[PDB]
């Protein structure tokens, strides 16, 4: 009894001291927490990165004191003083748990619905890695993914997407305990809804009866072919009434001793280490790849591999759409990165995200390609879970417009400092007839405003490969790779220019003579800028052309490099088939921009580019206007 009550009142006491947060949810889930963590959860406080630990996700991240209490009591590096600093500036206990900051936190939750989607990704990674690595009974990948979620989570559409897909893929090691704390706007029959996803459902569990919860979890674990949801019905004075009379933050040694998990955790990891040694004796190359990939490290020869492939891409000098350049880059990277896991939100023939060796993940088998269905938000938040798990490097594609359907998952990846790769195709009015509901205008500009996010808009096959390789190399941030539907002309480059692509912007065509201005262009508009430079030169007006595949990356280059690309006092003109307003950061009040700030139109692409002023004459006149 007191083992649940200590969680209950540690939470209430820390919330009270902070005078911020909600104490009811952690208090209602204390028996659920006690049951899962003392009877089932396999974890080692001495090594929060133990490869085969069970993964726990508190999807209703507002109940954060529940998780902080559990980490403290079981012996993680989180102290009473840390709990006394709940929600205080720079404390180890922010109001929502933060991955990478606090040992034992598996994901950053707060925005509702995404936690269960993260967990689906973690369970998917376990399934994928188990199919790939486990061999003749040596099951080095074998752990569960447990989730606590609440009513807010279940109302959100992203929970529908993630749990629907989890049902189709038969994720039997995903086990959800739902805090059903209800007796107007929420009347769903949750057991019936989750039956319709193909889940195993344990309804009507007494959420304060540890015997009932343990039996339900046992039933969930036995259902190996379906994810499970367990519907847990939950409900100073209350303190001594519930039998907890210790003052705030006082915990007796006997209760710390009963809760401590270091002895059991150590024996767990030692037992796994013995299994991995048997595995390493029989499968040493696989064993070494498992460690590399779980450690989230790239192959030692990655850069030399990419450099060789880039030289070959240049030898081909293909004029293709960069969505095809993307598929070519994926092929190149996949040879080198066995951890690569692709997918698309029902746009595989459009995003061009499969490669020659992609194997679709199914209910019965592993693979390296996920058909997410028409579920962009689910895809983004599932990819966050895939990358948090370790062992795989996911990418997932949709049309650039539908970045808006998964927008907060993109932001949460950046906040968590993780490195999923978000792929987007059909990036401008250049997509043509599908019209203004699909034609991006402002999306690329808005994506650039996400802190700790790299946005790449490569102009040809060479920039596309560099963008992919840089996205794959980045250790602590995500990337958006933005690709065109229409063919883009390959640009010739020196060896130095090729090597400067990774600096985000570079001079792709210097002026013949002293530059009178600089044209900054990205993606599909570089060719237009180069053509305008030639027309201007024929009029005796010398300008330089700068390709800026990533503003994000250019902005963190040293000042000398940025000045070498964009010299002070040289008028700047930006050309991009999107909203103009972000370019004033570069061109200022006396520069200019060739862009589009209104909605698109349903028509062939060539006509739209002409109608909206993406023409040589307009770029030339605009350049002249700032001289």
* Residues carrying an active site annotation: 376
DSSP per-residue string spanning 112-141:
TTHHHHHHHHHHHHHHHHHHHH-BTTB-S-
What residues have CB less than 8 Å from 32, skipping those under 6 apart? 148, 177, 179, 207, 213, 232, 234
Q: In this structure, are residues 118 and 389 in contact, taking their beta carbons and an 8 Å threshold?
A: no
- How many C-alpha atoms does 532 have within 13 Å on its Cβ side? 30
The beta-strand segments (E) located in 426-530 are: 454-456, 479-482, 487-488, 506-509, 517-521
Window of 58-66, 90-98, 400-408, 476-484 that interacts with Ca ion by CB under 5 A: 58-66
Stretch that binds Ca ion, among 181-189, 201-209, 409-417, 606-614 (CB under 5 A): 181-189
CA atoms of 508 and 518, how far apart (whole Å): 11
Work out whether 522 is an interface residue with Ca ion (CB under 5 A).
Answer: no
User: In the complex, what is the shortest distance from the CB of residue 152 to Ca ion, in angstroms, rounded to a whole number?
Assistant: 3
Within 350-416, strands assigned E span 369-371, 393-399
The radius of gyration computed from the CA coordinates of the chain, to the nearest angstrom, equals 27
State which residue, 29 or 466, has the beta carbon closest to Ca ion.
29
| 183 known ligand binder | yes
Give the one residue of 2, 60, 85, 443 binding Ca ion; rule: CB under 5 A.
Answer: 60
- The alpha carbon dihedral of 317, 323, 327, 332 has a sign of positive
Minimum CB–partner distance for residue 169 and Ca ion (Å): 24
In the complex, what is the shortest distance from the CB of residue 62 to Ca ion, in angstroms, rounded to a whole number?
A: 7
Q: Measure Cα distances from 362 to 35, 165, 199, 377, 396 in Å.
A: 32, 11, 16, 20, 17
Could you tell me how far CA 93 lies from the centroid of its own chain? 23
Residues 431, 439 contacting (CB under 8 angstroms): yes
- By the rule CB under 5 A, 152 interacts with Ca ion: yes
**CA-angle at 552, arms to 547 and 555, nearest 5°:** 85
The piece of 134-142, 157-165, 175-183, 240-248 that touches Ca ion (CB under 5 A) is 175-183
Contact between 151 and Ca ion per CB under 5 A: yes
Q: Which is nearer to Ca ion, 182 or 189 (CB)?
A: 182
Within 364-423, the residues that bind Ca ion by CB under 5 A are: none
Question: Partners of 520 in the beta sheet?
Answer: 546, 574
Q: Which is nearer to Ca ion, 26 or 367 (CB)?
A: 26
Least gap, CB of 589 to Ca ion (angstroms) = 32
Between 110 and 378, CB nearer to Ca ion: 110
According to the binding rule CB under 5 A, does residue 434 interact with Ca ion?
no
Nearer to Ca ion, 152 or 198 (CB): 152
| Residue closer to Ca ion, measured from CB, 22 or 221 | 22
For residue 601, the minimal CB distance to Ca ion (Å) is 5
SS3 382: helix
Question: Nearer Cβ to Ca ion, position 28 or 396?
Answer: 28
* Among 104, 150, 170, 549, contact with Ca ion (rule: CB under 5 A): 150
Exactly one of 182, 308, 319, 362 binds Ca ion (CB under 5 A); that residue is: 182
Segment interacting with Ca ion (CB under 5 A) among 173-181, 293-301, 424-432, 486-494: 173-181
- H runs (alpha helix) in 245-321: 253-259, 262-282, 284-294, 302-316
Give the nearer residue to Ca ion in terms of CB position, either 152 or 390. Answer: 152
Least separation in angstroms between residue 182's CB and Ca ion is: 5
Quick note: the x/- pattern for Ca ion over 276-315, rule CB under 5 A, is: ----------------------------------------
Stretch that binds Ca ion, among 9-17, 54-62, 363-371, 536-544 (CB under 5 A): 54-62
CA atoms within 13 A on the CB side of 65: 30
Residue 625 binds Ca ion, judged by CB under 5 A? no
CB 466 within 8 Å of CB 307: no
Task: State the minimum distance, in angstroms, from the CB of residue 525 to Ca ion.
Answer: 23
CA 335 to chain centre: 23
Q: Which two tokens stand for residue 98?
A: 């933060």
Binding segment (CB under 5 A) for Ca ion, from list 26-34, 142-150, 266-274, 346-354: 142-150
Q: How far is the CB of 151 from Ca ion (least distance, A)?
A: 4
For residue 112, say whether it is annotated as part of any ligand binding site.
yes
Q: How far is CA 621 from CA 134, 258, 584, 602, 616, in A?
A: 64, 78, 19, 27, 9
| Known binding residues for substrate | 22, 323, 350, 426, 434, 438, 485
Give the residue ranges of the annotated binding site. Answer: 22, 62, 110-112, 151-153, 181-183, 323, 350, 402, 426, 434, 438, 485, 601
Interaction site with Ca ion (CB under 5 A): 60, 150-153, 181-182
Q: Residues marked as binding for Mg(2+)?
A: 151, 181, 183
């Amino acid at each position: 009894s007191q083992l649940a009550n200590v969680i209950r009142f540690l939470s209430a006491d820390a919330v009270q001291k902070a005078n911020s947060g909600h104490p009811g949810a952690p208090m209602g889930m204390a028996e659920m927490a006690e049951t899962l963590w003392t009877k089932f959860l396999n974890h080692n406080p001495a090594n929060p990165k133990f490869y085969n630990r069970d993964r726990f996700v508190l999807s209703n991240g507002h109940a954060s004191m529940l998780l902080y209490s559990l980490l403290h009591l079981t012996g993680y590096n989180l102290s009473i003083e840390d709990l006394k600093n709940f929600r205080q500036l720079h404390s180890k206990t922010p109001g929502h748990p933060e991955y990478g900051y606090t040992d034992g936190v598996e994901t950053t939750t707060g925005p509702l619905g995404q936690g269960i989607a993260n967990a689906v990704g973690m369970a998917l990674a376990e399934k994928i890695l188990a199919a790939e690595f486990n061999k003749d009974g040596l099951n080095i990948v074998d752990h569960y993914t447990y989730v606590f979620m609440g009513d807010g989570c279940l109302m959100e559409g992203v929970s529908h997407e993630a749990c629907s897909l989890a049902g189709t893929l038969g994720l039997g090691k995903l086990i959800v305990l739902y805090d059903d704390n209800n007796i107007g706007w929420f009347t769903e029959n949750i057991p019936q809804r989750f039956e319709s996803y193909g889940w195993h459902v344990v309804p009507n569990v007494n959420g304060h009866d540890t015997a009932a919860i343990q039996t339900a979890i046992e039933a969930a674990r036995a259902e190996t072919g379906k994810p499970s949801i367990i519907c847990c019905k939950t409900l100073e004075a209350t303190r001594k009434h519930l039998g907890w009379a210790y003052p705030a933050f006082e915990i007796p040694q006997e209760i710390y001793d009963a809760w401590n998990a270091k002895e059991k955790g150590a024996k767990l990891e030692a037992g796994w280490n013995e299994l991995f040694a048997q595995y390493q004796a029989k499968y040493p190359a696989e064993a070494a790849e498992f460690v590399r990939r779980m450690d989230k490290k790239l192959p030692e020869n990655f850069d030399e591999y990419v450099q060789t492939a880039l030289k070959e891409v240049c030898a081909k000098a293909e004029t293709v759409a960069t969505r095809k350049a993307s598929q070519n880059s994926i092929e190149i990277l996949a040879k080198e990165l066995p951890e690569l896991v692709g997918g698309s939100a029902d746009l595989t023939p459009s995003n061009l995200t499969d490669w020659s060796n992609s194997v679709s993940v199914t209910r019965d088998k592993g693979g390296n390609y996920i058909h997410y269905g028409v579920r962009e938000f689910g895809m983004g938040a599932i990819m966050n879970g895939l990358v948090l798990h370790g062992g795989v490097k996911p990418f997932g594609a949709t049309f650039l417009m539908f970045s808006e359907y998964e927008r907060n998952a993109l932001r949460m990846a950046a906040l968590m400092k993780i490195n999923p790769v978000f792929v987007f195709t059909h990036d401008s009015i250049g997509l043509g007839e599908d019209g203004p509901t699909h034609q991006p205008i402002e999306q690329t500009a808005t994506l650039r405003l996400i802190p700790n996010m790299d946005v790449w808009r490569p102009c040809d096959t060479a920039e596309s490969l560099v963008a992919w390789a840089e996205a794959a190399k980045a250790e602590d941030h995500p990337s958006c790779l933005i690709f065109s539907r229409q063919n883009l002309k390959f640009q010739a480059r020196s060896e130095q220019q090729l090597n400067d692509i990774k600096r985000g912007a570079y001079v792709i065509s210097e002026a013949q003579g002293n530059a009178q201005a600089v044209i900054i262009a990205t993606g599909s508009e570089v060719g237009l800028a180069v053509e305008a430079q030639k027309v201007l030169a024929g009029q005796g007006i010398a300008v330089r052309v700068v390709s800026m595949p990533s503003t994000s990356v250019f902005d963190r280059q040293d000042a000398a490099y940025q000045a070498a690309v964009l010299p002070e006092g040289l008028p700047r003109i930006a050309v991009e088939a999107g909203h103009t307003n972000g370019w004033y950061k570069y061109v200022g009040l006396n520069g200019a921009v060739v862009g589009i700030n209104r909605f698109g139109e349903s028509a062939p692409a060539d006509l739209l580019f002409k109608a909206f002023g993406f023409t040589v004459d307009n770029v030339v006149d605009t350049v002249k206007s700032v001289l």
